[PDB]
């Protein structure tokens, strides 16, 4: 049931590049965040 | 002075209360299609068709011709499906 809203597209007509970044949370959980400047982890304090 | 309708009113069947719970005609074409399919209903009031030249069409006409050829619709549909 989670394979439904995971599929996404950006519908804004003009937009900069987005890249799949592994966002680590405060309890060590990964989120696929579409972020420019193709980093690989953003560790939030 | 009033006279009761000589039959069901066109809009009486639909519910008047809870009109929020009734789906609305979101487009023009669905209303158009409902209107055209209602236009040929046998209304009890005066209408275009009552006056404009139908030659009193409804009456069975005598068929003088060959009987239709007996076909097996099950096998024919199966063959069309395979095609």
């Amino acid at each position: 049931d989670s394979s439904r809203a995971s599929l996404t597209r950006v519908h804004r007509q003009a937009y900069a590049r987005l890249y799949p970044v592994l966002l680590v949370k405060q309890d060590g959980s990964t989120i696929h965040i579409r972020y420019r400047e193709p980093r690989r982890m953003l560790a939030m304090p | 002075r009033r006279t009761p309708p000589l039959g069901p009113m066109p809009n009486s069947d639909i519910d008047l209360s809870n009109l929020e719970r009734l789906e609305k005609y979101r487009s023009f074409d669905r209303y158009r299609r409902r209107a055209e399919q209602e236009a040929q209903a046998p209304h009890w009031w005066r209408t275009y068709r009552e006056y404009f030249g139908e030659k009193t069409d409804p009456k069975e006409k005598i068929d003088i011709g060959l009987p239709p050829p007996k076909v097996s619709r099950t096998q024919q549909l199966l063959e069309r499906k395979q095609a």
Partner: protein
């Protein structure tokens, strides 16, 4: 004519209740009609917020299609402006200096009119089953001014 059996055939404004209300600033909120044996809610708000605008919008579109297909009334849906969170990055060796990275936070709001007991618990369990990744959900009360 008024004396004829076909009187009142062109009556339509009883069908269209819309008296063209100025529905851009009105605060005529429906309350929770609770009869005991017949419970219904008022205007409960739903807030989905995430760091990803595309996934948040996809979730909003999915719930909107689901609720429109479920045959319950949707009054209005909209979106909150973007929130930017900066990550102040302390260095490994020298912690005194302060660098930074940029990040964004998005939001969208969907509202619901009718909620029966079984129907609304069903809707809640289904939306938690289909809740997506990275999007935080919170259903709250109506009064929320920008």
């Amino acid at each position: 004519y008024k004396t004829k059996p076909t009187h009142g055939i062109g009556k339509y404004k009883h069908l269209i209740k819309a008296e063209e209300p100025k529905k851009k600033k009105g605060k005529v909120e429906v309350r929770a009609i609770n009869l005991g044996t017949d419970y219904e809610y008022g205007v409960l708000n739903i807030h989905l917020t995430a760091y990803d605008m595309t996934l948040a919008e996809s979730y909003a579109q999915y719930v909107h299609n689901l609720c429109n297909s479920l045959s319950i009334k949707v009054e209005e849906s909209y979106a909150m402006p973007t929130k930017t969170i900066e990550v102040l990055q302390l260095q490994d060796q020298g912690s005194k200096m302060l660098l930074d990275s940029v990040l964004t936070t998005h939001e969208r709001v969907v509202q619901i009119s009718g909620l029966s007991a079984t129907f609304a618990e069903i809707f809640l369990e289904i939306i938690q089953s289909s809740l997506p990744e990275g999007v935080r959900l919170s259903v709250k009360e109506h009064t929320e001014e920008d």
